[PDB]
């Protein structure tokens, strides 16, 4: 599963965790199995307008 | 007339309800937890912890 979010909610993806982004657009289970990749893409996905 | 005459009965009566008493009188410990009650660590604490 893929989506793009801002650089300070990454730490949002985990586990029991909780916050506007885990509750509101995509919980993950307590049990979950699998893992996370996050990279940034400042210079790409960002546009100075 | 004389009293005292029936140690062993009351003995036994005495330790069934000493047993009794204070198996029920375990349910107040804390056993390291935040709370003794469960409903105050529910409404507390969201589940990881």
Redesign the interface.
Same mark, same amino acid.
């Given at each position: 599963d893929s989506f793009v979010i801002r650089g300070d909610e990454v730490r949002q993806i985990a586990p029991?965790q909780?916050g506007k982004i885990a509750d509101y657009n995509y919980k993950l289970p307590?049990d979950f199995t699998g893992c996370v990749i996050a990279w940034n893409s400042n210079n790409l996905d960002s546009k100075v307008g | 007339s004389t009293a005292s005459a029936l140690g062993k009965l009351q003995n036994v009566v005495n330790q069934n309800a000493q047993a009794l008493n204070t198996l029920v009188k375990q349910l107040s410990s804390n056993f390291g937890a935040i709370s003794s009650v469960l409903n105050d660590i529910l409404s507390r604490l969201? $589940? $990881?912890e």
């Open positions: 029991g909780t307590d | 969201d $589940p $990881p």
